[model samples]
Target: XXXXXVVSDAFFNGIKNQAGSGCEGKNFYTRSAFLSAVNAYPGFAHGGTEVEGKREIAAFFAHVTHQTGHFCYISEINKSNAYCDASNRWPCAAGQKYYGRGPLQISWNYNYGPAGRDIGFNGLADPNRVAQDAVIAFKTALWFWMNNVHRLMPQGFGATIRAINGLECNGNNPAQMNARVGYYKQYCQQLRVDPGPNLTC
Candidate 1:
């Protein structure tokens, strides 16, 4: 598995390169916090996999996260007008808490929070705020989505990561966003000394 420094260095520099001043004051995605979260997630960084695969996975993971969090500017989505409440019988919204997008991958929706919390050893349904308030928990929610592969994204590579984020908005319709993600992945891959691999577009 890639060490904490390498992963942290790669992400820290990666966002700096892509977002420039956008990440200013964005302290949630710190080196120590990010490293701890990835380390906690066993399958992250493509653990038990080849170096290239690991690097690609890392790039994919960071690309989506950076994009979702607006270069890690806000732990929770900005201008959250709607509560993102589904009120589904399963994973119903908490009484007073709103289930807006939070954390790196912007984990949103009541159903998502419910399962992610259970998986990450928390009560997401009860307290979605934890995703934004707790740094490790914030990253954990993102990793939970990444490793869980709800859409089997990792197996298909980085493009699939984009798909998992919001295929409806990005699958084939949003070239600008897709290109942005690919750009970040490419930069991170180069810095990581990897080939940026196939499907790098």
Candidate 2:
């Protein structure tokens, strides 16, 4: 009923490990967590038409796969910065560094707290919850896609790349951007939908 009518169990099994992330990652982004999150967000893949919806699903997971290297990583490996910016609205939870976590790798103090409030968790105080709870992790990713990139699906996968990480678009990280496009195309091919126009940013 969920999943926008695409992504059968077998199909997900085959593609999710395409990067060969090994056991831990294979189990991290579980099908149950996926379906549960999908159920929580009916609007996620219900963009316009069935094709459009499927494409959105593919694009969404493509970024997820790319971000986590096929779910190999729960927390961002590179904790280069604390990922906190001074703000009264969502002050950084002391001793916590919000680098990146969850499928979409939601980062920073502002995003963590806001996403926590939206998803009924304390993203600021317990940002690690994004990595700890798989359901919350998937939900965080879905929440991010719906709020940020879902509206841009009609513009094709390119817009999504720019929206998610502008550095990977334009004249910057072309290879990584292409990596996302590649995954999107592959998923679309498997889903039997056109990859659509503007596949790159």
Candidate 3:
């Protein structure tokens, strides 16, 4: 069953100050936007999972989203240093374009953008910046990444979500980054009054 309002506005507001500096307005990390994204991914959230599992998914999802976008004030990463272009033939980069971290999960690289766009009904390759422009689209892109079982080893849990978001950064080697995510998950779970489940790490 779809649990009604596991994450109340009050709970979200309780930790809003800790999440980011402030909202930038117009599709900029509102509670509504986040809920909409969560509601869209049914199997991933409360729809198909236990209430505890669902809340943990929410915690896991937002922890990384908060880390990447920081209340989603900036659509893309402040530092667009590398352009995030990859030469792989599987998901080749577009000429004269750069795909740096954008949206919640810092969706980067041509490979990620291409599939995210294709799946979510957007032209990620042609206009990767749309991720920063459209609020719902931005959230959608992040959910798309979260719901997809991209990595096999880290399957279907908060740990897997960390891998999905940035295995290169949070996959065991960087304990601080891993701890930060786990910390947010624990905090959010507390706010929601949920157990945060067994795989809380």
Candidate 4:
């Protein structure tokens, strides 16, 4: 049988941190959906080409969780004006057409080709690739997170948001900033990690 300490320590070590604090309603729904997409990846559990372990897998999804706000934005299909609406739509860098869909969970277009190529998706042409294929979506997220590690960590929200709006990340609206902070807190709790500060501008 497994050693009790090992079992307890490890289990508690990986307990459902952020279990209830901010994981209700929409937020929890997004988390579950992202995890479900990740689970579709057959190699996800073994770390196929990575370090190997639940922590690594968890790290990957945690980033994804952070990016898409739990995949709640993927279903938004309005190409009306780049940043669809208050519900979904990620405002890309002002003049980019590949700005919609789940191109990058962050909603950038520069990532579609690479993400599509990696997962062999038609995502480059069809932004819906993220919603259509779970594996491709996960791969896209992993690629973006790993590739832009510096751009989406700790408190990169302002820079990230502004990059899409062509405005200063520092001048973000109060309500938006607050919502993002809330998300930041949620991820910190879920991944059982620390989010440091709000750093709003």
Candidate 5:
């Protein structure tokens, strides 16, 4: 398992290298791929520990997964087919659709306007869009993590995973366990410094 983990990381980095860091600006397809992978993490919204680097990375993955529907779906709209190739991807004010890439994964065009404008991006001029911009996506993720991790932990989002994901955290295989494996691959393992109480997945 550990070997496989290393291999997966190596492969992921290699693929990123091939795509080029500028994918978000260089080509639409590359930007989409980057977004797809990031959204596959669990406990994205209200979970994750800032204990250490690896733990933070795990939290990052969790948040991405939560937002992008386990990474199965990529945001798209009428003009932006970069991620999954959909339509009408921009956000509308007072009942308007926000544009970008995946459903919650919005990318370029009008889709990125809101987040971009909020984060200080020109949105309209940027093709990489909100979904494609690594910094923006992650910053949004961190926002979600710090804001909601405590409130939702009881329901088993971030901290719950940390408490019982087989690696270190465990909690009597609670009811949310089934939902756990699919999303909580390594919930507790995220806390690199503490190691907390061990729990079986």
Candidate 6:
């Protein structure tokens, strides 16, 4: 089965249509692009039962919902941050700042390098490709998720928050962390799965 088997069009559309949502970039993030990307990561939500699959989908979009402002943004609003980290293996390209981009908003040169090589893109030289190509955008998001956040799912939604941005944990940013959990709870409810414990990171 495809990602639609677990993440229906209804679920995808419903996420952005939620109350007080601001999906300004709604048209940019297409459902078909997501499915196309999932074609390359068949193991994503296929690792377990239907409910587990739905939960994983919910968990994934929860972070995505929060990060992208209910699918509103493709690139991070604040580009002033130093998302680039010079590396011998993946040196930061001159004049390139790997700020958050894509559905998952992968930041930093370290992540871009690996994601680029794996996804067949010059992430260091052309990191903007993640935001420009819809399929590639979803691919980069799923790519980062599978590599860095997939296994942490067994640890509950809290672990995902930690994996995505640990600075939001431990009362560092209660409101932001709660916002992510809120989305998680809302999505899990919609997906008809009981959100497991450790809701907070």
Deviation of model 2 at 99, angstroms: 0.8
lDDT of 2: 0.84
lDDT of 6 by residue, 1-201 (tens): 256666788888886665334544677787889999888887787667766677788888999888888788889898877676665689988888899998899999988999998889899999988888889899999999999998888788899899998799998999999999998898888777899888898
- Candidate 5 lDDT by residue in tens digits, 75-106: 43254233322255443334223443432344
TM-score of 4: 0.49
* lDDT by residue for model 2 (6-86), tens: 778877777665665463566677877888878778898787988898899889879988998877778887876779899
- Which is superior by TM-score, 2 or 4? 2
Per-residue error at 140 for model 6, in Å? 0.8
For model 2, where is the 10-residue window of minimal lDDT? 17-26
TM-score for each model: 0.64, 0.93, 0.61, 0.49, 0.38, 0.91
Highest TM-score model number: 2
TM-score of 6: 0.91
Query: What TM-score would candidate 2 get against the native?
Result: 0.93
lDDT of 3 by residue, 91-170 (tens): 53445234433333444455455545544634445544444544454454545454453232133345544555555253
Candidate 4, residue 4: Cα displacement in angstroms equals 21
Best of the two (5, 6) by lDDT? 6
Error of 1 at 200 (Å): 6.9
Local accuracy by lDDT, each model: 0.49, 0.84, 0.47, 0.43, 0.40, 0.84
Q: Residue 54 in candidate 2 has what lDDT?
A: 85
Report how far residue 180 has shifted in candidate 5, in Å: 5.1
Q: What is the lDDT of residue 126 in candidate 6?
A: 96
Q: Measure candidate 1: CA RMSD.
A: 4.3
What residue pairs are clashing in model 6? none
Q: Which stretches of candidate 4 lie over 4 Å from their true place?
A: 1-71, 80-99, 103-109, 149-168
